[model samples]
Target: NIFEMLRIDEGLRLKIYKDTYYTIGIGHLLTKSLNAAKSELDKAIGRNTNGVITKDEAEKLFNQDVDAAVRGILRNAKLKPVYDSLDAVRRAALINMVFQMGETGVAGFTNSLRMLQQKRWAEAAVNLAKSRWYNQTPNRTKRVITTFATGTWDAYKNLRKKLEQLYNRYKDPQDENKIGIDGIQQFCDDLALDPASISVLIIAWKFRAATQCEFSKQEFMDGMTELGCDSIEKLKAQIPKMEQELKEPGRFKDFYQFTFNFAKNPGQKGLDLEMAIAYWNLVLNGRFKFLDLWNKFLLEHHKRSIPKDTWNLLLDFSTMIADDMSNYDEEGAWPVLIDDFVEFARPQI
Candidate 1:
């Protein structure tokens, strides 16, 4: 059976990075989210010897995981050529590749897989060798590559299947490939996220989404593929880190700029005054010391939609100016809104 094959390729393990495994498993990791590990370790045990699995149980778990991995491999229609094209032994190699490096890792082999589709063996091998995986796991890759390139069963066999059509799980019904407002609502639900949060905006920024509350399937795939998020667990694992990524100043500025466009309705002249104020809180609430006073000034005096210049310049204003007006550039290119705010807040300062 293929069980023996995987066992040979990926050595048995009790724990790796807080995950307990008889064999390397796919899906369901929550490292930042577990006892996180201790809580997870406690749950892995059943009728047992302190978080340990019996040999029989381990075999059960391995076969179950193997079944799940194969089903998972089948889900992505993108890899259909690999299925329809390979010999049985080669298919086994692909399967083991997913098990060892993970499906997300394997999904990144776009160049190699494309070459494989045409049976350009050396080119496929060359591209696969170009990967971090090649550098990271020479022995495992040697066998997998040999099996893939030569189609032989020497410690591996050459293989082969067909594929199903791809569908975006979050596709909007009316929009086809695009995820509309409702589609994104479901998407957020699946990720266990709130659509209103800045974190969701980060995902949109990653997709380089043109309009708010909408995304194309191609953009989604490109974003997910780039992130190596080929699975739900892999994506979920990344969610905690993404917002933390925004803490950096440069990317935050890019994202901050993105929010203005994302929030602005297409064909509208300037960002809505009330809307811009709300977004300012989301983006600059913690970072900008004068946000409250700025909001107060906007609400009390200049009750007009903000132009793009004022919008972008606000970031420049926050960064260059300080809590005190000592280094303030009074004669600089500060917008009227800034000028008004400075005048309004001078006595308070």
Candidate 2:
């Protein structure tokens, strides 16, 4: 079996054809020697005496290399959501396609990627077939499309088990399908989080929970579906993207404004100073350069509640002014609180 598994490829000649050789196994060359006399071939035709790879060894190497190649394809594609949403065989098919056509060539299938992201499998397969990659390799394309169309979605079943495990611990007293306050508290504890933390807010947003501390079956299913989180692993993969959202100016502003309504006291027109400060620390998490100054000002001067307008304008103020307050424009319209803070900071300037 070992003898049948390995073969020698006659490498390019230097001055003499029979004087150089290389050993090949499973389509990859294994030799470094160029001179036939110095090769594993023992300098003889029709014979390889120096070495051989066993069938098991060959398979191990093949899997190792293929796994690494697929990882590279996934990295270069930068399609984390798409990759995480797919079944194993289809993922392999994608890796193979990327390997056949270089990363840029594979990336050129923009419509195919969009279709795939939308989980329009048949449409994506059809789009893939229309490409030059399919034209050049019809047989391979057919195989890949077959996998894309019919690959087992085993993750979905696995995801249900995980969800059941999570939900069973906290199902409502009366309704089996719903989770109430106690359930949410346990859920937060499972993630090592406080119910009031910004992480809980993001998770609630992701789950589309009806209120601060409740989850319905429909909301849980729909939110998980939209997030492409069929598994805990996939859900964990979203953390980086979630955190990155706060770094974007537009999205962060949206999140900042949304949090005002989300975190406000249930029956109050304004947020309590302590609660507002806590939310700021959690949401900003040191990303806003002058957030400390804003917090300090709030702690020193404001003792009651923060109005909605002040909450909204605070983000704009932070964005427009440089960290050192060097770019603070006296002429620009600023909220009274920001003007007060600017005056407070001017002494340090």
Candidate 3:
């Protein structure tokens, strides 16, 4: 199976996290509450594991060793609040480190945290060096530990702030920056494909397909394609005509044909386009949640409904429009990286 090579099993990842989470001292992690964290880990396991391990089995595995320890740690009011304040990403970073190294492998930046707690500047930096996590994931862990340990937390704080900014940029709803890479894959081997273009194209297509009106599809595709295109000059020359067509209603018959095509054939099935619409949309539409539009629906329906419920309604409506363009790329006329449909949609269209 394809999954065997990729090792893409979510359950397996959770099992790794869980077995590791418990094997390491859950007691030490107790400074933060484990209820929500446990629930999340369990849920991930449930989905990926396909419920082989009963919910009760999972709960016992977590609570038997670590949960009690964590609960005890959080019982301390002062320590509890301090632990509670750590952001979600930071927690993930720490947990992931522990997950890799086991509890003993957990980075012991104790002196560093202690120094920072007391506002001791010089000593905390020295303390951050004590643990092996710093040596293993030096760049990432060092920065995070430095933030928590030092008086001048900027070394770590700045990096984290920048990370948060980038995360928000791509994850932002109004802004269209989600097309960036996940801090990996620095070089581009493919001329017509890069992380930015690949991510942006599918996402933009999804966004356009969902909306009833495609006010920006052509322009968005044009911009995305330029980033993915081999020849920018040729694309530039074609811009005037695309713009001219935009001015004349129903004149750009080819543009609509291409747009419809992109929406329909949203991914390169076998090729590494860096992404495919189906692959990402599966992730987005599957586990990810966007929590907005609740009030808008309540106003429309005049009855109470959860925010997700309303958002689903809007998404369903968008899906209807999107159905027309589904998988138009299967005809295989265009290259996977720079399909003509996308090329035509570019600003140079």
Give the candidate number with the greatest lDDT. 1
Per-residue C-alpha lDDT of model 1 across residues 1-349, encoded as one tens digit per residue: 4655554455443333344522222233424542354455355544433334444555666766767777888887766568678778778778888877677778788878888878898878777877777777665676678877877655432211000022256677777767777777877888888998877877888767777766776566546544545455667787767778787888888898888998998999689999999889988977888989999899889878889889988888888777776677677879877987887787899
Best by TM-score: 1
lDDT of 2 at 219: 64
How large an RMSD does model 1 have? 20.0
Which window of 10 residues has the lowest lDDT sum in candidate 2? 5-14
lDDT per prediction?
Answer: 0.70, 0.63, 0.36
Q: TM-score for all predictions? A: 0.55, 0.50, 0.28
Off by over 4 Å in 1: 1-168
Candidate 3, lDDT over the whole model: 0.36
Candidate 2 collision pairs = 19-36, 20-36
Pick by TM-score: 2 or 3, better one = 2
Better of 1 and 3 by lDDT: 1
